[PDB]
Amino acid sequence: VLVVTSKVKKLIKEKGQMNTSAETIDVLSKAIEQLCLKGVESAKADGRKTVMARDIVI
Amino acid sequence: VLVVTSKVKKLIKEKGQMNTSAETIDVLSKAIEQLCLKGVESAKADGRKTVMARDIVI
């Protein structure tokens, strides 16, 4: 799991009075994994050894 | 911070032999915050009290 589950659930509850399903946590974690892997692609294509904010295309 | 920093850095290092900048962590966390808030919008518009995977549009 790549998201901080407790903090995600807190944000959703305090900002929306919403509960958070388990599958929501899974999708968020998968989204982080994909952003990271695309970031690696971008950084390497640029000949760099560090993934930077400009590599996280959002 | 809404991402698990240590686990993000591990993924990027093990999958890309890349380092991870601090600003990368910040962008990932901001992305999670925005996905969560959009998820609250979608769930509430549907009259629900739980943010579900279908509310996280990725």
Numbering used by the authors:
A (entry chain A), B (entry chain A): 4 to 61
Paper text:
Our findings demonstrate that the single histone fold protein HBb forms a homodimer that has the ability to bind and bend DNA.
Except for the first three and last three amino acids, the full chain is clearly resolved in the electron density map. The dimer is stabilized primarily by hydrophobic contacts along the interface, involving residues L31, I35, and L38 in α2, as well as contributions from α1 (e.g. V11) and α3 (e.g. I59). Like HMfB, HBb features a conserved intramolecular salt bridge, known as the RD clamp, involving residues R51 and D58. In HBb, this motif is augmented by D49, which forms an additional salt bridge with R51, potentially stabilizing the conserved KT motif in loop l2.
